[PDB]
């Protein structure tokens, strides 16, 4: 969204005698966005001069032009959030000083004022500065830890609750969304590996967890290779137990996708690749060896069984109650989570416990595509079909959660994008089918549960505590243009 407000100034002072034209112009300026660099002191001084009338909104911008301008300005287009924001800030400082020379008072409602707007905006600019500095310092530039992550997300939530009243401004909303996208993308991969290890794990379970960790997080964790190399030689009598002959390796279903993760452990170095497309011995994906050689809770880390269960090519004689009880437990645990909006710390905790389950966004998408690839009609028992539909439930709600988390923000823009995201995910996830009705209801409940942004009517009343009958109009119009819903009616 771009609008050249200089030509808008031309229109404003060309037809200054008409209030309707100025109202229309300021309306498309509000729905539009303006570059910060294009804004100087002379620019919006001429904006004020071009509309010297003060009818209702012209007067409103006479008192609070700064807040109105920052409610629609854009900064992200020029690749300079902090720099353009601070340039805008000092030119607005010049504006505030000019108005103070004209006259200064805390008129209307003290919650919002040009001086108050400048103070809040400079506080936000500072918080942006610490966000960038902590990102730079704790990422080691351009490429325990858990208490540090907890503390830093604590200062981020403190800055959020400081900036919580300021969410209905486009510039503030986009800055906050960018910061939160950066922080979430950083935290989703920077999770530690303490919880993977347990006594009941076998060699295969731990090595598979380590492959998932390597393919999920390798930025600054460089000690993995040596540990894996040592563990290969420590377990010399173990990998041969659950491996099949190379002659009948690739022919069995499900092992084709497992070959990528398998060759990493066979070669003896995660840095190696199967570029030649050679043939190597294949771990037996059959559950007869799986149950005897690994714990059922770590099955999602193992792509072969996911692919085979989704494909329904597993023999009915093969036992599958292990993953049945494991998946029932995890589904019940994750469904019982409260509908209340989890805090940012709570959101990070729930994300990291999801990552502990091995649900990687790329992995989830790449192994959920086959679910629609698999034929709808197949011969199967009751419990395997129940497992397949529960797999659809869990995998698809995880995929929707992750693809909405990457754009998650407690701002109106997140809902504005997420409505279309939900429509697209309905069109792709379900298509024209119907048997996905209940899973779709559960997915909608989850996405409206964990990612619910809430605006209080009392919050708007505080927003308009001192606002008279005039300022309600355009504030409500901006809220409707941003959120897209007639979310209240003002009847005092």
């Amino acid at each position: 969204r771009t609008v050249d407000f200089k030509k808008l100034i031309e229109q404003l002072r060309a037809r200054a005698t008409d209030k309707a034209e100025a109202l229309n112009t300021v309306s498309q300026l509000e729905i539009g966005a303006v570059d910060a660099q294009d804004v100087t002191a002379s620019a919006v001084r001429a904006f004020v001069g071009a509309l010297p009338s003060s009818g209702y909104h012209f007067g409103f911008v006479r008192q609070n032009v700064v807040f109105y301008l920052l409610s629609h300005a854009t900064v992200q287009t020029a690749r300079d959030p902090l720099y353009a924001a601070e340039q805008l800030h000092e030119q607005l400082d010049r504006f505030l000083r000019h108005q103070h020379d004209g006259g200064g008072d805390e008129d209307r409602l003290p919650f919002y004022h040009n001086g108050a707007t400048l103070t809040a905006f400079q506080k936000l600019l500072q918080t942006l500065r610490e966000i960038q500095t902590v990102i730079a310092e704790q990422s080691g530039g351009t490429a325990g830890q858990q208490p540090l992550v907890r503390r830093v997300i604590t200062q981020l939530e403190t800055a959020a609750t400081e900036a919580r009243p300021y969410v209905n401004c486009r510039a503030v909303a986009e800055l906050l969304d960018l910061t939160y996208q950066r922080l979430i993308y950083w935290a989703c991969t920077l999770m530690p590996y303490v919880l993977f290890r347990r006594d009941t794990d076998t060699e295969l379970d731990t090595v598979l967890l380590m492959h998932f960790f390597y393919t999920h997080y390798r930025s600054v964790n460089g000690d993995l290779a040596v540990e894996f190399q040592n563990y290969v030689k420590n377990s010399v009598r173990h990998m041969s137990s659950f491996v099949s002959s190379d002659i009948d390796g690739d022919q069995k279903p499900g092992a084709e996708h497992m070959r990528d993760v398998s060759y990493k452990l066979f070669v003896g170095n995660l840095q190696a690749r199967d570029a030649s497309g050679l043939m190597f011995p294949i771990i037996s994906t059959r559950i007869s060896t799986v149950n005897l050689y690994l714990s059922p809770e770590r099955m999602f880390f193992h792509p072969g069984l996911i692919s085979r269960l989704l494909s329904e090519e597993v023999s009915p004689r093969a036992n599958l109650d292990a993953y049945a009880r494991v998946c029932d437990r995890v589904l019940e645990d994750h469904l019982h989570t409260p509908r209340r909006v989890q805090r940012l710390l709570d959101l990070t905790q729930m994300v990291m416990r999801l990552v502990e389950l091995g649900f990687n966004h790329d992995t989830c998408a790449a192994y959920a595509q086959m679910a629609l690839i698999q034929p709808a009609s197949q011969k199967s028992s009751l419990f395997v079909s129940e497992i397949r539909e529960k797999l659809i439930q869990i995998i698809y709600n995880f995929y929707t959660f992750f693809m909405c988390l990457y754009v998650y923000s407690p701002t109106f823009l997140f809902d504005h994008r997420r409505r279309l995201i939900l429509e697209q995910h309905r069109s792709t996830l379900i298509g024209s089918k119907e048997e996905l009705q209940h899973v779709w209801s559960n997915v909608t409940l989850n996405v409206n549960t964990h990612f619910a942004v809430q605006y209080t009517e009392e919050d708007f009343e505080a927003h308009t505590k001192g606002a008279t009958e005039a300022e309600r109009e355009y504030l409500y119009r901006d809220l409707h243009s941003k959120w897209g819903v007639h979310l209240f009616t003002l009847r005092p």
Binding site: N24, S27, Q28, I31, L420, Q424, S481
Partner: peptide, 19 residues
């Protein structure tokens, strides 16, 4: 209040194109 509806419909059309 008509041209704003024009612009919203155009933005929805662009979003459909992106989808």
């Amino acid at each position: 209040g008509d041209l704003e509806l024009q612009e919203t419909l155009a933005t929805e059309y662009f979003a459909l194109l992106h989808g």
